[PDB]
Symmetry: D2
Subunit: 255 residues, 4 copies
């Protein structure tokens, strides 16, 4: 039912600047009793898409209502137009997500057990989610890409307002086969027998990335990596992501 | 040194409503390194005066700059026009301060040792400070009333905009000898051998409460309770409280 | 179409303290061109229920998403446990809503035309909505009480956490025939031919206030005051108010 | 004097993302009476330095206290590590400042007369201030660079945490004689007789940029452009900028 909505602005050693972060911290009885041990909460790292920021899930969905119902802490960082990369000409935004993870688990009552930690996000943030799932599989038991970009070239080549592809990839001529390519990261994770979080992939059938989502899950099936895929009516918008994140939160906290 | 500025809004079980709270949390390297143990911070509970709220210290002083310099966490709650009382007709705002104290020490990396915990505030908040110092002396090693109301009639009889004295005290003819009277609370602390935090009492010489402050320290001297009193040029305003809280923070963290 | 989410804290002359307010301001191209006259937006005054505040509609609904779709500015004030009254022992919160109305229409590009201004709210805020609709009908063309208290005793006699009925009504043993009684305000508006905003009344069938809603619309029918009533599955919670305020916004903005 | 502190987050068409902005809006009578035309305020565009953001002036200075004393609205945008440039690989942050100027003058009661509009900022923001002063002289009657970078090479060649010079200037081997060079902007302003805002230049004597400031004012003297230069004890920190912005605000409004 009740929780805390928290806005934090701290000077990040990784990206060299003050940066805003938002946190949903559902209430627990132990948080109000100085005689009892704090019960650490299950925790979701939740990644915004391109043009969104740390405020937009709160504004355009009812995520705090869903999170409070399931006692799930939610961490919402801001990564600008970075695509969750350590940018060639810009900020170290991949490392920044690792810093945020460590920081909030140190200063808040969040469980540090892998089974209690999840990651999710939409569009550019679903791309970010799969990138972290395949390279930081020891940190998250479950990962939920929503309406994700899996073929990196479609996001690097998109002509969105003020977006600079070169800020991210620099001198790279293509992203295929680089750290920016989720298919390469997947091949590397399997080849090196890394832990892959349990995967729930969701995408609206009217989304322009729907075919891209179908291509990725087919490849997952061909390399014997399990996943759950949920589709249905929905487009590339927060009307879909509001309903999708509600369904995702129920899925992540039940197992 | 850098820190986090934190804005929290949570549903309070004590006062039955969502309520904002602000927190300054200076940064420590242990907060970013998952391999080391988090070092708990010294903590100040800082109480606003009448017409102010949880935002006004940040807005009208440079308090976060001072706190960051001394690695001091600062907790700034909102108690409206309550005078930090469990109100006759209103909210349980005395109890709320205790709830805020417990909550932030549970969810944040704040030291729970009495020697690491301080309380301070100006005007109505200096009245609140002395009330908590004399009734919750086990929670604070030091207390700093700034420009405080010590003779409770001086606060209750004020004709400030929209302020209701009866909301606080109900039908009481006088507050002398009641839980609203710092002189009664002081006599009772002495009589019951309660621990009294170290007192630093500050007031500007042009403050209309200056004589009220001199009367209180005169009484403290007459009952052999130690204190440090600092005055000088200054009035009943945030220009004075900015400089006073700066000098107070240095005093509380040294020794 | 996106917009601005605004958090404002100003010292109120009416309530004698700093208070927080939240505003949703959808974007118009006139806002970005210094050569054109700003186009004023339709504006909704949205009132929270008991235990909520200025943040809770944003946190527990997708109201900003709905408002942006319909280019509707939304004003969300905080009135604590006041029931939108000028309190017997407390603050002038009825007058405060009038001050907020004037203030935001002055400092923001909001239409001052009656036909462009609406008011809505749930539970205690639906009680507030009907009180303002029946006493300030010249300020609002439409009013939408959601899950409202219409029989004031149902609100006052509530044993809600930390709630003080006497702070609001003083020593009164009944509220019938007073400014706290919507039925009296309705009788007085009908008798004096006041402008009554066009009325849309919504309540969930599982809400404990559902019968109170049926009683009020039954009275409206007996006295030939027009209204639209919409019910259906739903309880006394933000899951219902999220859906209801989306439906209400669509109703206000068109015809 | 009391005012509003405003935090806004809107989706910017220029930079293609949600972005936070803070505004100080001192109160005026007309703001509380909707029957009158609102009175427009004098307005200052205040630009942060490297590693700061839209929150840091509020947090580390008492700027709102100073602004309220002089009924000066203050606009504090966020421009990250951009150096206020339209970045070679990044965002169009020069255009963004112009968008913010137009946006806040449309939606808030801000005077559009050149004589009522000022710009100021420290370090990277002092560099930004002089760039806008020399290229947008029709928008600002006065400009106040604080501890500014005037020799652009010292900012671009800085080795600050996560800072990318290439993101700003691309492969350029020097910035001399370019739009990133204040001396070139100065020569072109003088050559084309464009109006130069009245200049107040301040820097602390212990600042590592002090000589850079001395070089710039010497050049202004040699090309017969007036200025007032104020130095004194002070370093490259917010202890200095707090006192400097207080002195600057008194100068701007008094004219
Ligand atoms: Na995206
Ligand atoms: Na006071
Ligand atoms: Na209610
Ligand atoms: Na700088």
């Amino acid at each position: 039912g009740p929780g805390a909505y928290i806005s934090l602005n701290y000077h990040s050693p990784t990206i060299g600047m003050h940066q805003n972060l938002t946190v949903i911290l559902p209430e627990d009885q132990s948080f109000f009793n100085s005689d009892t041990t704090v019960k650490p909460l299950k925790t979701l790292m939740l990644l915004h898409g391109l043009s969104s920021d740390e405020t937009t899930y709160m504004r355009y969905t009812s995520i705090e209502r869903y999170a409070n119902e399931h006692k799930l802490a939610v961490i919402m960082p801001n990564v600008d137009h970075s695509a969750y990369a350590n940018m060639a000409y810009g900020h170290s935004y991949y490392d920044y997500i690792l810093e945020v993870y460590d920081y909030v688990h140190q200063i808040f009552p969040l469980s540090k057990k892998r089974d209690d930690n999840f990651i999710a996000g939409h569009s550019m943030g679903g791309y970010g989610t799969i990138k972290f799932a395949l390279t930081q599989g020891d940190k998250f038991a479950k990962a939920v890409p929503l309406s994700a970009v899996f073929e990196a070239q479609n996001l690097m080549d998109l002509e969105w307002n003020d977006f600079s592809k070169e800020a991210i990839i620099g001198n790279l001529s293509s992203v295929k086969g680089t750290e920016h390519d989720p298919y390469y990261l997947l091949d590397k994770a399997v080849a090196e027998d890394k832990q892959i979080p349990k995967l729930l992939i969701m995408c609206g059938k009217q989304d322009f990335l729907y075919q891209d989502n179908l291509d990725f899950i087919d490849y997952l099936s061909r390399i014997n990596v399990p996943y759950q895929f949920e589709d249905g009516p929905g487009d590339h918008d927060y009307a879909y992501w509001d309903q999708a994140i509600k369904r995702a939160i129920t899925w992540m906290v039940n197992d």
